[PDB]
Amino acid sequence: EPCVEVVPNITYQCMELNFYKIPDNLPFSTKNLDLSFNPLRHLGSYSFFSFPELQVLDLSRCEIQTIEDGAYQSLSHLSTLILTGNPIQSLALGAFSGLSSLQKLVAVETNLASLENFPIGHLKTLKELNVAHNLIQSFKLPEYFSNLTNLEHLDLSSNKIQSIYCTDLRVLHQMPLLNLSLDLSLNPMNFIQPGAFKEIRLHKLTLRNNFDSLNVMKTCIQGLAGLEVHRLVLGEFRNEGNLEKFDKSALEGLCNLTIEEFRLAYLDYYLDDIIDLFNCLTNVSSFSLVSVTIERVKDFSYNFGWQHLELVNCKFGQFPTLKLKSLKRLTFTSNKGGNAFSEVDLPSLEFLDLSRNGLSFKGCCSQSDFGTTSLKYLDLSFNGVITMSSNFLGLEQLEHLDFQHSNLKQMSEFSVFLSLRNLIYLDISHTHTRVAFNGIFNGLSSLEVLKMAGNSFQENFLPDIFTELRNLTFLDLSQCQLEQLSPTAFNSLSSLQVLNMSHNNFFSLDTFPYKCLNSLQVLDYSLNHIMTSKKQELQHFPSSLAFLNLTQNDFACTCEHQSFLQWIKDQRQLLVEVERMECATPSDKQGMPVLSLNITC
Amino acid sequence: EPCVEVVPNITYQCMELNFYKIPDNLPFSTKNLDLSFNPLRHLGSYSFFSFPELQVLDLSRCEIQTIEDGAYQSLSHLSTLILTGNPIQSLALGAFSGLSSLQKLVAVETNLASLENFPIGHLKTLKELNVAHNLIQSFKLPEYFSNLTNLEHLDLSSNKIQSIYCTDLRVLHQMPLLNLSLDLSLNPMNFIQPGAFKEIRLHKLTLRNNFDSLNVMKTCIQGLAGLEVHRLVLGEFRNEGNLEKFDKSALEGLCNLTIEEFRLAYLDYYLDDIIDLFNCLTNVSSFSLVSVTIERVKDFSYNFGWQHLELVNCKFGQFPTLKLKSLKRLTFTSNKGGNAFSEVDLPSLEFLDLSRNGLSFKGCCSQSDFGTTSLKYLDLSFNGVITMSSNFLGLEQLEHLDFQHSNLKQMSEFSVFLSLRNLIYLDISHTHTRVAFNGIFNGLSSLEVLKMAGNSFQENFLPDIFTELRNLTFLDLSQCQLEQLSPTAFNSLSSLQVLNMSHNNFFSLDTFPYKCLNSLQVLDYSLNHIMTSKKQELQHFPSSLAFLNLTQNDFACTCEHQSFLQWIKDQRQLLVEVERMECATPSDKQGMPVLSLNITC
Amino acid sequence: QKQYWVCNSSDASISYTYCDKMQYPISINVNPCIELKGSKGLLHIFYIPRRDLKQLYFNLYITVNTMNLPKRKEVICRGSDDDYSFCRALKGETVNTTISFSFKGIKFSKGKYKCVVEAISGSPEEMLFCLEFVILHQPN
Amino acid sequence: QKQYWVCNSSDASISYTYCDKMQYPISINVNPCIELKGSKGLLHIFYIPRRDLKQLYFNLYITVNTMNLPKRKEVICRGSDDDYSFCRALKGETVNTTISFSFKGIKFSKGKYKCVVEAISGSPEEMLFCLEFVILHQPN
């Protein structure tokens, strides 16, 4: 059994161990077996029998040259078979007989030259068939595709198809219901016979890096005419042959197609115009551009009927002045470009993610910044500086707001959140805030979560700023260099359940403030510098308090604090990882669990 | 003597104490006397005699109605006389006789109706004469101005002059040397007779809020033709009547003037163009615009021969793309506008102040950002985010660099200062740096000052990052949350003199690291949390160490630390403010100077 | 000790007292009266300083229903060719001016606001005057 | 234990060893050879992974003459319609690709640089391979 037992009686990975023959010294209950990178080279009849209850079989790169009739005859439960990278020469007419439950068949780079003779026509349960990186030249789907009634995914990418003739799709004309997601990327396409796709319906179609010239692309997209796709994905690969031009006509053909969601995934050419270029996708409901340079675009004002717009990893320079009236959700993230946000005007906007762009806002937050009054979600995390100068006038409905990791300024200069009466989630962790106004959170009634880790307070004393946050159920307050603490702080947080106070600078754990935390269940206090206890009223810990981390500190293990070091032992039914509560003061006795000391005085 | 004695035997302020007559109960040595806001009302002969050694006399708002012959007859040393706000009715022909040393005469709002009969023609030592806020209607300078050979400052602002005729300046045509700085602001000007200024020479001329319309302004500036001014200041006041238009012709006239330095100070109208507007000041060497809106300007590319350009408190929006080839110094500060810097191209630039603009740089710092390789001074303090991605390639000559109060990023990601072999001053205080690379300062050989207060270090341990900073003579390291300390740190800083370590988080003052600080003279260690001393090698304090602040801490005044609390007393010849070294541990003995304790054990 | 009444709008009621020893008189008119929901009008002042307004600046100590906001330094007059004409004013000069103002964009709680406005000016710079403003706010 | 030699330029000398248990072979060519003063060329790789390249990413541990720089997470393949074609690669698929690169703008000290490049990928994500690069730099 040089194999590795990942999940006893269940999952074994005998990968690359020079097996010339299938192991047998393994349990019968086995459901997942990986026999990758082993020189099997001959898959004969009933090769697998030692595993009648198998569900997943990985035969990746096993030099398998010939599979005979009924090699997996006894695998009725097998749903996934992976044969990636095998130099197949002979494939028996009934090699896949017995897999009455096969849903996923992976035959990538298996020397497969034609879909015509692939013996799978009886696997009715087949959901996805991956045959990418093979020698297929024709797109003519076999007749047996009829019996394949549960097929949803077909990967024909990286093959040798060069043209699509009408007759190739004849099989589909006879399968009404047929949620097929097709990938034809990296096939040297150069001709799709006109009218070949008339009344054909795909759920998804991906054609990336298929066409040689712009003219070859426009020609093929014409043969695509009449198609109905739910989601269509075009574009190319960064590490392969790209188009030398992509002018305002490249996408003309899409006008004679019925598309619901569109996505252009990576284009080397620097876009010039955006309105003449995409007006055939105007009726589209979801529009996406990932990794495309749009610096050269002067007008971002056209009113497309798009409802979801997603721009990720694009180079832009000046911030796009969007004025899409029907748009409801906008995802503008991880874009390498400028560093200055400017107003947008999205009257219908409800979801707004503008995170990870290094953007800087010179005046937050108002409805005049976005042009909407229906915003419910707002994510401006991971950006540059965000100066607060308006307490969300017009954004009353915000339920979610994330400023995480963005330098925020003017926080304690007035009540910036005064209008957010419905805000439920709020993360301002590591936003370099310096709380210095006890009205910092006024307005946040409905608030339930509040992550303000990584910051700091004036004088390092935690004031009474939570007195209005009733439904408050979570509250991170770690890394805030807190030292002192107002005893009346948490006193109104009845529903509060968790309360992080980790990695701070406390030296004396207390227990009075937590007296009224009815629902309090968790209370992290780790990575601090506690050891003392300036008040032995150590009984005031809520009746529901289950967990109470106190791991890693600088305890005082000298009789000097026998009174407090004992209380720790007294209730080790609330603590956590005790093998990490090592002592710190005895230069001779350090590293021994505090819940194990000779209390000899 | 209800008076206030500010500087015994020297300065007294008897302001607003109902004095109806000059005091006498004051010393003879008095040099500065303030008798403002007292009802004197009659300044008779030899009124001041009790003060023969007076230099400065303030008679502001004293209801003085009449001054007679020789009122200050015995004040030969008086150089400054202030009579601001006195309702003068009668001014004796020889009221100012005796002031053989008067340099400054202030007669603002003194009901003065004509410069003609003002009896000052004999005060040859007069440097400045301020007669603003008065009823003067003519600009015709009196003949006695000849004997006034040391006059450099004349304030005629806020008067009633409405026109300037050629004969008015005839006096000047007869004073070759004459460094006169004139202010005519707030005078309802509307006509300056052509050729009136031919061959006249002023050092400075200020004409703010003088003209009613644009046409009235253009007309006057024409009569100004032929003038030679060193510095000319135009513009208006924010709280007064402004011009309704300021188009490209408003400044045509300046082309027939000889100007060395120009400044437009505040203009309500929003500028349209900048190149057609100021081409008459193209030969000017110093160009300034304070408080003027330039949003509406599309081209900032013209090549003016300006050598100094100063833009302060202007509204701009998009960052000005300056391409001034001859410019040597640029001061662009406190501008309310955009938040994104873009490249400039100033080949001759040597001084560059771009502080307090809230600007954000996305890739600092290279020569391609400024277009120069002669930059010696660079101030980018008080701005937004500044991402470091180039270690000053091409800015080798930088001697001064101030990033103070600007969120800096990517500091510990490589040696950002690697090229600054000549940098002498460097302030990165409160730039939110988190030192985590012991090569953070490589390249900074010549460095002599280093202010990195307000930041933080990885693990709060101060590494060996100063080993290359030889000539280093100053080093602020306060507010950096420092706790531990590498004993080899400062070991190479032989020339180091000062060393701030204030407001940190040290608990145990040491003395080993400072062993080799030859020149060390100062060593602040205040506002910490020291009390212990984990090594009684308290003798290793440099031989030159004079001062050693240790004020305000949390000392341990219990016999437990008799060994260390004693060392403090032992050398109170190095300490500082001892009345602020209060104890902290004895809940009964706290607040008593540590250099005063009953060491009873 | 006397409380002086500036004005009332529909949003607020503004009044002030002195917070300094010497209580030099000031004339303060606001037209129209301030509205915390956003307003813009002319502020007419008449004063006769006891110092020079050279490099003036207020230190502001605002208070929201017992709550305290950090100090605020607002500069009027930086010192050279300033925006306002009254910066040039000297120790005993009559200052009769009209300053325009405008603002908008911030929602304030309901309650009592008090703002101590300590004015400072002069070359060595010393206090000019101190006033404590009491402004009552009733929203909606 | 064998050290493999990638190439030499006029700025540097690049070589690598393995830092992981299993030492699956890789083909690495750089044309032209990297120049720390700034260069741009093609990086040809040939590999046959033992995991899926799905959501690949390197963890970089750089070292400058004994000095240590923070960890660096560099992502190749975010996971959906990725830039590179090799992201789609499966467990036993042959990966013969050519990636283009380019850079400029940073001055490096003279000395020995070592960069541990731990590659990670897969849905549950586990290490793919670990390589330790030794690059000698001689400026001017």
Ligand SMILES: *O[C@H]1[C@H](O[C@H]2O[C@H]([C@@H](O)CO[C@H]3O[C@H]([C@@H](O)CO)[C@@H](O)[C@H](O)[C@@H]3O)[C@@H](O*)[C@H](O)[C@@H]2O)[C@H](O)[C@@H](O[C@H]2[C@@H]([C@H](O)CO)O[C@@](OC[C@H]3O[C@@H](OC[C@H]4O[C@H](O)[C@H](N)[C@@H](O)[C@@H]4O)[C@H](N)[C@@H](O)[C@@H]3O)(C(=O)O)C[C@H]2O[C@]2(C(=O)O)C[C@@H](O)[C@@H](O)[C@@H]([C@H](O)CO)O2)O[C@@H]1[C@@H](O)CO
């Ligand atoms: O939206 C833009 C705005 O564009 C619009 O205005 C253009 C034009 O009308 C501007 O001024 C002309 O008109 C005025 C006067 O007749 C108006 O009644 C005249 O006196 C001027 O000389 C001039 O001829 C119009 O053509 C456009 O189509 C647009 O409608 C502007 O581009 C700009 O303007 C604002 C400022 C400017 O920032 C100063 O350089 O100028 C005005 O104000 C002076 C006033 O400003 C106060 O500060 C404003 C805010 O600043 C920070 O964010 C503070 N934290 C915040 O509290 C302040 O609210 C300052 N406090 C006062 O003491 C100053 O006296 C001006 O010249 O009148 C206008 C001002 O815009 C606003 C305003 O934001 O307050 C907005 C305007 O839409 C309008 O509602 C005016 C009112 O008419 C004023 O009564 O008020 O920027 C804005 C925005 O981009 C800002 O984000």
Ligand SMILES: *O[C@H]1[C@H](O[C@H]2O[C@H]([C@@H](O)CO[C@H]3O[C@H]([C@@H](O)CO)[C@@H](O)[C@H](O)[C@@H]3O)[C@@H](O*)[C@H](O)[C@@H]2O)[C@H](O)[C@@H](O[C@H]2[C@@H]([C@H](O)CO)O[C@@](OC[C@H]3O[C@@H](OC[C@H]4O[C@H](O)[C@H](N)[C@@H](O)[C@@H]4O)[C@H](N)[C@@H](O)[C@@H]3O)(C(=O)O)C[C@H]2O[C@]2(C(=O)O)C[C@@H](O)[C@@H](O)[C@@H]([C@H](O)CO)O2)O[C@@H]1[C@@H](O)CO
């Ligand atoms: O100065 C601008 C720059 O304008 C100039 O270039 C225009 C045009 O030539 C751009 O590309 C065309 O040409 C290339 C090729 O033929 C060039 O030999 C072709 O393949 C393209 O499809 C396209 O047709 C020209 O028309 C203009 O007049 C100007 O001369 C550009 O606007 C821009 O360009 C840079 C990037 C771009 O940012 C990516 O969206 O694109 C190029 O690079 C890809 C390459 O980028 C590398 O990253 C660059 C830096 O990024 C950060 O700052 C990192 N911290 C830093 O380390 C990097 O140095 C990435 N690492 C590689 O893996 C990517 O493959 C490109 O498409 O070729 C060009 C690039 O500009 C530069 C460069 O900065 O490296 C500068 C150029 O002037 C030129 O010198 C090229 C070399 O020819 C490349 O061999 O290199 O932005 C810059 C600046 O504003 C940036 O601040």
Ligand SMILES: *[C@@H]1O[C@H](CO)[C@@H](O[C@@H]2O[C@H](CO)[C@@H](O)[C@H](O)[C@H]2NC(C)=O)[C@H](O)[C@H]1NC(C)=O
């Ligand atoms: C409290 O906050 C700390 C950090 O401030 C959290 O720490 C993480 O905890 C996980 C699991 O214990 C570790 O694997 C991570 O390395 C820690 N990293 C972080 C985020 O610092 C801690 O999980 C928080 N606890 C609660 C209950 O919220």
Ligand SMILES: *[C@@H]1O[C@H](CO)[C@@H](O[C@@H]2O[C@H](CO)[C@@H](O)[C@H](O)[C@H]2NC(C)=O)[C@H](O)[C@H]1NC(C)=O
């Ligand atoms: C201290 O103990 C708490 C409570 O057990 C830990 O909190 C868990 O943190 C993980 C983060 O990986 C969360 O996913 C869990 O929900 C938390 N567990 C629960 C329910 O309490 C916390 O990680 C510990 N802090 C330390 C020392 O790392």
Ligand SMILES: *[C@@H]1O[C@H](CO)[C@@H](O[C@@H]2O[C@H](CO)[C@@H](O)[C@H](O)[C@H]2NC(C)=O)[C@H](O)[C@H]1NC(C)=O
């Ligand atoms: C060392 O740095 C501290 C800053 O942390 C300086 O402290 C300030 O000192 C002045 C004295 O003129 C006080 O008025 C400030 O209030 C202090 N600021 C703080 C810490 O609150 C200190 O001056 C520096 N010491 C030296 C020698 O320059």
Ligand SMILES: *[C@@H]1O[C@H](CO)[C@@H](O[C@@H]2O[C@H](CO)[C@@H](O)[C@H](O)[C@H]2NC(C)=O)[C@H](O)[C@H]1NC(C)=O
């Ligand atoms: C500790 O004492 C030193 C002097 O012994 C104080 O330093 C002075 O600080 C002021 C204001 O920053 C400077 O103008 C002086 O030049 C400093 N004196 C010198 C030469 O050291 C320091 O402020 C004190 N620390 C605190 C905050 O109490």
Ligand SMILES: *[C@@H]1O[C@H](CO)[C@@H](O)[C@H](O)[C@H]1NC(C)=O
């Ligand atoms: C369809 O598949 C069944 C087995 O599932 C097979 O018996 C039948 O021959 C197939 N139909 C044809 C003739 O294509």
Ligand SMILES: *[C@@H]1O[C@H](CO)[C@@H](O)[C@H](O)[C@H]1NC(C)=O
């Ligand atoms: C099939 O279509 C349904 C909706 O018609 C969708 O929920 C499902 O994800 C699709 N399956 C795929 C990925 O082909």
Ligand SMILES: *[C@@H]1O[C@H](CO)[C@@H](O)[C@H](O)[C@H]1NC(C)=O
């Ligand atoms: C939380 O408080 C809000 C206050 O508006 C209330 O509407 C909501 O019902 C509370 N959450 C629940 C359902 O407990």
Ligand SMILES: *[C@@H]1O[C@H](CO)[C@@H](O)[C@H](O)[C@H]1NC(C)=O
């Ligand atoms: C000039 O000054 C002298 C002082 O000696 C005085 O006697 C004479 O009257 C003055 N004459 C003029 C030019 O006003």
Ligand SMILES: *[C@@H]1O[C@H](CO)[C@@H](O)[C@H](O)[C@H]1NC(C)=O
């Ligand atoms: C007089 O001119 C000189 C140089 O021309 C200048 O330095 C000086 O400031 C001027 N007078 C004064 C002190 O204003």
Ligand SMILES: *[C@@H]1O[C@H](CO)[C@@H](O)[C@H](O)[C@H]1NC(C)=O
């Ligand atoms: C300061 O150091 C520089 C080199 O960094 C050296 O040229 C110069 O002589 C030093 N100054 C003195 C006199 O110590």
Ligand SMILES: *[C@@H]1O[C@H](CO)[C@@H](O)[C@H](O)[C@H]1NC(C)=O
């Ligand atoms: C203030 O100036 C106005 C405007 O010129 C004037 O009408 C008024 O008389 C002055 N107020 C007083 C009485 O000082």
Ligand SMILES: *[C@@H]1O[C@H](CO)[C@@H](O)[C@H](O)[C@H]1NC(C)=O
């Ligand atoms: C690698 O790919 C190239 C380009 O297609 C091809 O010529 C060669 O046969 C392949 N060789 C390798 C390294 O397997």
Ligand SMILES: [Mg+2]
């Ligand atoms: Mg390219």
Ligand SMILES: [Mg+2]
């Ligand atoms: Mg105005």
